[PDB]
Amino acid sequence: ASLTEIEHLVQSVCKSYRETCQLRLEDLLRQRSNIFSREEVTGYQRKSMWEMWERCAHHLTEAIQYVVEFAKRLSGFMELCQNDQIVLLKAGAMEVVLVRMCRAYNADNRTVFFEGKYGGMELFRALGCSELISSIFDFSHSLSALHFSEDEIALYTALVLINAHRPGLQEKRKVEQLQYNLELAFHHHLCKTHRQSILAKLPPKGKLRSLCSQHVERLQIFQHLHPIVV
C-alpha cells in the first residue's frame, strides 16, 4: 500500500462519512442555544418509561440506518461475505452511533440534542437507568473535550466498525487486512494534521462495547427484535 493508496483511502472514508453523517455539524452547533424549557423537560420526565424507551429506540435505529449506509460505502466492506457484514454491523453500528453522537453533545451546559432541542441527562429520568445515562454523558463529556474533527470521526468510526476481533467472523483474515489499511490511513492523516496526540487519549475499545452492552441490558426488557434493513 503506497502513499497514494493510503491517502486515497483517507479521502474516500471521509467522503462516505460526510454523505452519511445524518445531521451537519454546522446545524448541531448553531442549535446549541435552542434548549428545552423547564416545562418541556417535565413533559419528558412524565412520559411513561414505555414511551421514552420507544422514542429513544426509534432515534437510535434511525442513527444506525445512517451507519449502515456509511458501511455500505466503505470500499472493502461490500467485498466481505454477507455473514461478516451482518456480524460487524450487529456488533459495531451502535458503537459508531455513540461516537458520532458526541457531536451532538455540548460540554458547556452538559446537554445533548434530542428531538429538536438540547437537554440535560434529566430528560431521560423516566427510563429509570440513571447510572447508564450518566456513563453515556461522562463518556461524551470526555470525548467532547478533545474536539474530534469530522474527518477524525470518519476515520475512527471506520475502525470502530472494521474490527477483526468480532466473534462469529468467517473471513477474519480479510477483515484484518482491511482494519490494517484503515489504521494506516487514520495514523497517516493524524500525522499530516499534527493530531497524533489524540491516540493516547482515545477511549479503550472495550469501553464502547460495555456502554453499548450495558445499554442493551437495561433496554432488553422493553425492546428486542428490531427490524433494520441492509
Ligand X SMILES: CCS(=O)(=O)c1ccc(CC(=O)Nc2ccc(C(C)(C)C(=O)Nc3ccccc3)cc2)cc1
Binding residues vs ligand X (CB under 6 A): 21-23, 56, 59-60, 63, 94, 97-98, 100-101, 103-104, 112-114, 124, 133, 136, 212, 215
Taking the complex as a whole, the smallest distance from the CB of residue 184 to ligand X amounts, in Å, to 26
Cell matching residue 227: 427490524
Taking the complex as a whole, the smallest distance from the CB of residue 173 to ligand X amounts, in Å, to 30
Residue 77's nearest CA partner among 146, 9, 3 is 9
Taking the complex as a whole, the smallest distance from the CB of residue 6 to ligand X amounts, in Å, to 27
Return the number of the residue (28 or 184) whose C-beta is nearest ligand X.
Answer: 28
Question: Burial level of 177, CB count in 10 A (0-12/13-18/19+)?
Answer: middle
Taking the complex as a whole, the smallest distance from the CB of residue 42 to ligand X amounts, in Å, to 17
Return the number of the residue (6 or 125) whose C-beta is nearest ligand X.
Answer: 125
Return the number of the residue (80 or 102) whose C-beta is nearest ligand X.
Answer: 102
Return the number of the residue (142 or 181) whose C-beta is nearest ligand X.
Answer: 142
Taking the complex as a whole, the smallest distance from the CB of residue 155 to ligand X amounts, in Å, to 16
Taking the alpha carbons of 40, 45, 51, 53 in that order, is the dihedral positive or negative?
positive
Distance CA 197, CA 138 (A): 21
Contacts of 18 by beta carbon, 8 Å cutoff, 6+ apart: 150, 154
For 146-184, give the DSSP string: T---HHHHHHHHHHHHS-TT-TT-S-HHHHHHHHHHHHH
Return the number of the residue (30 or 59) whose C-beta is nearest ligand X.
Answer: 59
